[PDB]
Amino acid sequence: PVAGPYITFTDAVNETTIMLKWMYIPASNNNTPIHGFYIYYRPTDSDNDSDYKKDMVEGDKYWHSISHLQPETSYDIKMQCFNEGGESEFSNVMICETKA
Amino acid sequence: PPRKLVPLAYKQFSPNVPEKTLGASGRYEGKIARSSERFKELTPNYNPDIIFKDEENTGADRLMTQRCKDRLNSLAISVMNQWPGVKLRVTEGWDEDGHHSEESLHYEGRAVDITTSDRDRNKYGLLARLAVEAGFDWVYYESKAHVHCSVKS
Ligand SMILES: [Ca+2]
Ligand SMILES: [Ca+2]
Numbered sequence: 001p002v003a004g005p006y007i008t009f010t011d012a013v014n015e016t017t018i019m020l021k022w023m024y025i026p027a028s029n030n031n032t033p034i035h036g037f038y039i040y041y042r043p044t045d046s047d048n049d050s051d052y053k054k055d056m057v058e059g060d061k062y063w064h065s066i067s068h069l070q071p072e073t074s075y076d077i078k079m080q081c082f083n084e085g086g087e088s089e090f091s092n093v094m095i096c097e098t099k100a
Numbered sequence: 101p102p103r104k105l106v107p108l109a110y111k112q113f114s115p116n117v118p119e120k121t122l123g124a125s126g127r128y129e130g131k132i133a134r135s136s137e138r139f140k141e142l143t144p145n146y147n148p149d150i151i152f153k154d155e156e157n158t159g160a161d162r163l164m165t166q167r168c169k170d171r172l173n174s175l176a177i178s179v180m181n182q183w184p185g186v187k188l189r190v191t192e193g194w195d196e197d198g199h200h201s202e203e204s205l206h207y208e209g210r211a212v213d214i215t216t217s218d219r220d221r222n223k224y225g226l227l228a229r230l231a232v233e234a235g236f237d238w239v240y241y242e243s244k245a246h247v248h249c250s251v252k253s
């Protein structure tokens with residue numbers, strides 16, 4: 001896969017978790033099969049791409065919830081789809097904060 | 101030689117009026133995309149003494165208006181003069197990722213989310229005051245994680 005997903009909405013569900021949704025259309029990827037998505041997130045106060053943590057979801061969901069985050073903290077969030085051939089480009093990068 | 105200032109309190113803004121008023125930054129004029137005719141009104145800021153987050157890897161943060169650029173460029177001097185060894189940091193400039201409330205001045209490259217390169221939030225109050233004195237038409241301690249700045253059109 002080459003073209004990545006597109007994060008459509010992100011928001012804080014509470015003090016330690018964030019909800020996000022996204023869209024995706026193949027044909028831009030020749031309709032290749034998709035075996036899931038990687039959701040990357042990192043404390044905004046970091047600028048090093050080695051600080052992103054990673055979550056796995058199946059290619060059958062358009063939304064997800066990132067748990068075990070820090071209260072009242074800002075996070076950079078981006079994602080990518082993938083198959084047995086590797087990962088796609090990163091989606092747009094969204095900045096979302098949790099609850100106080 | 102650093103100067104003695106009056107820090108802005110969290111969630112405070114200056115001038116003391118809504119951002120979209122004439123006494124502040126003015127009204128929203130439309131969302132600038134790459135395809136937008138007005139996109140060409142955005143110059144990239146390549147100041148060596150400004151740290152740009154650019155977590156998008158698109159250099160979108162550097163994109164802003166000539167006015168936002170002048171106000172920003174002189175704040176970079178104000179910050180180094182205040183805390184020698186510390187630089188101005190930008191976390192958000194013009195935006196096309198879309199996590200900002202509709203009619204956000206980020207979509208027009210007229211606003212910036214700023215911090216201190218060391219992320220010492222105790223410096224943010226002062227940082228906000230500096231932005232005000234740097235000529236920024238609107239300054240707003242928007243979050244614990246960043247200060248909000250914007251300019252007219
Ligand atoms: Ca950014
Ligand atoms: Ca952005």
Ligand SMILES: [Zn+2]
Pocket residue numbers: 192206211212213242248
């Ligand atoms: Zn902002």
